Design a binder for this molecule. Structure first.
Ligand SMILES: OC[C@H]1O[C@H](O[C@H]2[C@H](O)[C@@H](O)[C@H](O)O[C@@H]2CO)[C@H](O)[C@@H](O)[C@@H]1O
Length: 184
């Protein structure tokens, strides 16, 4: 299936609905008024590396002073890819904001430091392939029992607060995913 038709779930964290240049609908945040805190602080800033018509995805965020996450229903078995979108709109040195990302307890991104990877006010994406079959979730060479729900959590450590800007899940494999442009 083509790109829009292969997307099963998508969220603009801290924000309203937005359709991107590929035709992907990022839904308004389902955690509005629940756990965590929405912030539109980045709406004053140009976001480098991103396509300019889609900067609003990176200018809005959900963050928290304690661990938080999204629960996702997955209705059918198959191959999927999770894409997570981030920007650092406050700090401009390394080892200021650092956090882990977990999927059903598996650590899938260890010690993410957005500024160290891309700089200030610049797009950074993590691309995480997974498979659901025979009653199991498989991700990064690890395996556990799958019950129908995926729990995506952003873990509070010692260096400032975990955050996310947007996220989506598509059916397919890694070669099917649009990539950000190479960046210094
Ligand atoms: O909404 C802007 C940012 O707010 C928080 O950053 C805090 C930071 O944790 C604190 O140490 C400092 O004194 O103030 C800033 C701004 O309130 C979030 O942690 C960031 O992710 C947000 O971008």
């Amino acid at each position: 299936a083509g790109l829009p038709e292969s997307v099963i779930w998508a969220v603009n964290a801290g924000g309203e609905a937005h359709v991107d240049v590929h035709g992907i609908h990022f839904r308004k945040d389902p955690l509005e008024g629940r756990v965590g805190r929405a912030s539109d602080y980045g709406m004053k800033l140009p976001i480098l590396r991103s396509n300019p018509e889609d900067q609003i995805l990176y200018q809005t965020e959900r963050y928290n002073e304690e661990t938080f996450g999204y629960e996702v229903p997955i209705k059918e078995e198959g191959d999927y890819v999770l894409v997570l979108k981030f920007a650092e709109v406050y700090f401009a040195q390394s080892q200021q904001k650092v956090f882990d990302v977990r999927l059903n307890g598996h650590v899938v991104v260890k010690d993410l430091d957005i500024f160290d990877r891309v700089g200030h006010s610049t797009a950074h994406d993590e691309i995480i392939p997974m498979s659901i079959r025979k009653g199991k979730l498989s991700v990064q060479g690890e395996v556990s029992t799958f019950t129908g729900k995926l729990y995506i959590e952003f873990v509070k450590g010692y260096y400032d607060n975990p955050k996310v800007c947007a996220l989506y899940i598509m059916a397919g494999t890694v070669d099917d995913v649009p990539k950000l442009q190479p960046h210094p």
